[PDB]
């Protein structure tokens, strides 16, 4: 049913924020100052 | 690093009354089906961070 859907969003919205925000972080640190740490 | 101590519920059965106030955790429920406490397709906590 189309209900169970946003329902499933929402769950999505908030999880993927957060984890596409440290993801897209690192890679900032990596692009300004290179180590290989 | 990120502060995870700060939650709000995201999902609940019904707005609440002026004043009133929930810290219940019991899980939530998707679509018609049992999901005795387990998360999984259509139903999951209710808290997030
Ligand atoms: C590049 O960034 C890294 C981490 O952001 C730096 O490495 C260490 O960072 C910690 C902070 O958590 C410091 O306490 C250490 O002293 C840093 N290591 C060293 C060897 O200084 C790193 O310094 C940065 N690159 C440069 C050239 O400063």
Redesign the interface.
């Given at each position: 049913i189309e209900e169970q859907a946003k329902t499933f969003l929402d769950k999505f919205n908030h999880e993927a924020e957060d984890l596409f925000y440290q993801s897209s972080l690192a890679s900032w640190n990596y692009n300004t100052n290179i180590t290989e740490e | 690093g990120?502060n995870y101590n700060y939650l709000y519920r995201?999902?609940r059965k019904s707005n609440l009354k002026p004043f009133e106030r929930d810290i219940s955790t019991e899980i939530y429920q998707?679509?018609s089906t049992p999901c005795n406490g387990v998360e999984g397709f259509?139903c999951?906590f209710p808290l997030?961070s």
């Open positions: - | 990120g995201l999902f998707a679509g259509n999951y997030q």
